[PDB]
Subunit: 188 residues, 2 copies
């Protein structure tokens, strides 16, 4: 709808890599998250199965091993990497309404925050889920589960495929931002 | 019925302790086993409850912790301590039909086997069940139970009360047999 119209304006104001490659990969990630990945995680808790009769053990074991869902993490990441661009668009429009360094300092800082947000969320993915591969079986001993209980994840393989996809694209977006930084560094 | 009539005959052929005290304690144990204890163990497996959804885990955990039921052990013990008396009764009757040392050697050996059988079964009770107290909770990890499963025993306290009763009486029967041995030892 209006999203592509809005992205058209920020498309008209960027650099070689920024106009084309960064914008395409950003839309690439949104499409994957929306049309494909969001329904892989639909039954994440409904189809989580634990071999026990203890009431409440399923709730605490799912919450222990999935403190925040993968799709919610990706939704937050896309929002954080798109706000610096949104700020520049309004900042330029505000400057136009009133009417080198002013735009240069904002644009350079704008791509600096995207690298930080991109790397921070990638780091969170690794430490929180201990690698990018999801297991079929999780062993849970949190109260009130008696001793250790076996619980089984829903669609672990398909979730691994989409996890590798999102991580790979995010790593590419980091490299593109770094090269854009270098092109504005050699300019001096 | 005829059991007391049969016990009357062996009552007429024994010694001071043997005629009265050993016979009474033997009948004492049979009454407890039959009229009281046998229905404490009636629902031993029916009311054995395990906190799991694994099919077959209840069967293997009950079999692991109760390889042979207490009442079946006591039934075997009473049979074994009553056959030496039964042999003497037929041996004497056979001797009567045909018609000091011959009866003395049999009678002395007869009370010797009762001590051995009484002590052997008491030893089995201790090693197999690790003391004379039954626990409410047993932890079981035999296949196919996943990890360790909590299982709950039926009527553990009442079974402990009758276990202490049968063990105490059996220990008294050992002492009575030993004193009878001493009385036939000082005779020389």
């Amino acid at each position: 709808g209006t999203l592509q119209t809005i992205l058209g304006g920020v498309n008209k104001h960027s650099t070689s890599i920024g106009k084309i490659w960064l914008t395409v990969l950003f839309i690439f990630r949104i499409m994957i998250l929306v049309v494909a990945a969001k329904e892989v995680w639909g039954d994440e808790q409904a189809d989580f199965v634990c071999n026990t009769l203890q009431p409440g053990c399923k709730n605490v074991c799912y919450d222990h091993y999935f403190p925040i869902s993968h799709i919610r993490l990706w939704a937050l990441q896309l929002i954080f990497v798109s706000t610096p661009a949104l700020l520049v668009a309004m900042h330029v429009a505000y400057r136009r309404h009133e009417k080198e360094g002013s735009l240069w300092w904002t644009y350079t800082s704008s791509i600096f925050f995207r690298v930080i947000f991109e790397a921070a969320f990638m780091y969170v993915f690794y430490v929180m889920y201990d690698g990018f591969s999801m297991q079929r079986l999780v062993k849970c001993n949190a109260w009130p589960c008696p001793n250790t209980v076996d619980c089984f994840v829903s669609r672990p393989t398909e979730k691994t495929v989409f996890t590798v996809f999102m991580i790979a694209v995010s790593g590419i977006c980091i490299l593109l931002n770094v090269t854009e930084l270098c092109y504005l560094l050699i300019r001096y």
